[PDB]
Write a protein that binds this ligand. Sequence first.
Ligand SMILES: CCCCCCCCCCCCCCC
Ligand SMILES: [Ca+2]
Ligand code: NA
Ligand code: NA
Length: 294
Amino acid sequence: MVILGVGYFLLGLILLYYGSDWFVLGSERIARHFNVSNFVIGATVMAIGTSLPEILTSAYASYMHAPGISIGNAIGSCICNIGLVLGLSAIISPIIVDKNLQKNILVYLLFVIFAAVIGIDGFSWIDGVVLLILFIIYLRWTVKNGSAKNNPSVVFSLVLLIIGLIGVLVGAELFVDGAKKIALALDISDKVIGFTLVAFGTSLPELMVSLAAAKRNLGGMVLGNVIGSNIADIGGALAVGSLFMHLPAENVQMAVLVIMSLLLYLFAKYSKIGRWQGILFLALYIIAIASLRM
Ligand SMILES: CCCCCCCCCCCCCCC
Ligand SMILES: [Ca+2]
Ligand code: NA
Ligand code: NA
């Protein structure tokens, strides 16, 4: 069952490549239809849609008595979204953040700090409930501040979005599924092959989507996708995971995330998110994946 593993692998890449573009284009059209900014549509629809793997992963893992994976996958994705995903995107298409999206990012920072503080002694199911409620509040707050027949322009837009989303979710799965089949067929299969492959596999939707939007100079959409995903990973994935079982404290990873989130805000507020800010993000992500524990 090799080659068919290469089959799922390459095909998943193709579905990720074109699927992300369709998702970006469809989301961009939807945003203009509902008269909202690209940030808003990225922080809500796109973010939640791409964070669906994390939510299902964290829920399933915690239910299977593996709470370490649940919180590990959740936080690792957050670090990945700022370090790798935003890092690459910022370099491709530098972002100048308007004074109104700066407020949203500051709110994001507060949310992260709050999660880190209450997570010091781990995350209880009550911690999850609270985070999930704030998650819900953030969404409505974001949409309001960015708001205000079978129309063929609207239908085609929704088809682009949905099919594109299916493309990146199925594609990301085929990528991981093809990679597990190859490693097994080549007898090079550990168990953090493995945990590394799936945790990064859940981040593949955000990566390809944000890179697609970055290529089209949609920096607001990219920034929304990153900020929204992180909140969806904490208020959604991590929260749901804590409902099934107490999640052990990841104080080091949370600290890294808080620092990265702090850096993201300061750059957006007093400077820009461009090449050298993107380079710094990639540097920290590389240092993170080099010295953080598996
Ligand atoms: C919409 C559902 C939100 C989450 C509700 C979670 C309830 C979790 C209960 C976990 C066990 C609590 C045992 C207490 C002794
Ligand atoms: Ca706690
Ligand atoms: Na994801
Ligand atoms: Na996401």
